Structure 1
Amino acid sequence: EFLHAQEEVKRIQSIPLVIGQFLEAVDQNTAIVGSTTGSNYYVRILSTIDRELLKPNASVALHKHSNALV
């Protein structure tokens, strides 16, 4: 089941993804992203992402239908 869950998490990183700017971090797992579609969203960070590379205005790819910082 762990292998299956890891497969699902990896699949959620598939394409297409919308580009956005990581505005600010809120929690250990949520952040505020300004999507390039011209709207700002309070979304969820994927756990596997290295937090240290998440710097302000860093370009991030967001899930197409949930805008989660993928």
Structure 2
Amino acid sequence: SVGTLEEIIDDNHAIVSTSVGSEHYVSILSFVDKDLLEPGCSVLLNHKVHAVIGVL
């Protein structure tokens, strides 16, 4: 799935937003870098723990 960022917290997980507006503390698959992530970007999310999958 695909979501959108709001803020970035250093503890391997950050806050995202869904399409309709649900928001979760979900972690990053760390082979694609988090320095790619900026507030105001479109990301890749999971369904099972909704974890941040990668860079879109």
Q: TM-score range by the shorter chain?
A: 0.7 to 0.9
Gaps of 5+ in 2: none
Larger radius of gyration: 1
Q: Which amino acid aligns with 1:58?
A: C
1:31 to 14, 19, 23: 14
Give the superposed CA RMSD.
1.4
Is it true that 1:47 corresponds to 2:30 in the alignment? yes
Specify the SS of the correspondent of 1:67: coil
Query: In the aligned structure 1, how far is the partner of 2:43 from the partner of 2:20?
Result: 13
Normalised to the residue count of structure 1, the TM-score between the two structures is 0.65
CA contact (8 A) 1:29 1:46 kept: no
Q: Using the alignment, how far apart are the partners of 1:35 and 1:65 within structure 2?
A: 14
Alignment of 1:1-70 (within 5 A): 18-70=1-53
Runs of 4 or more off by more than 2 Å in structure 1? none
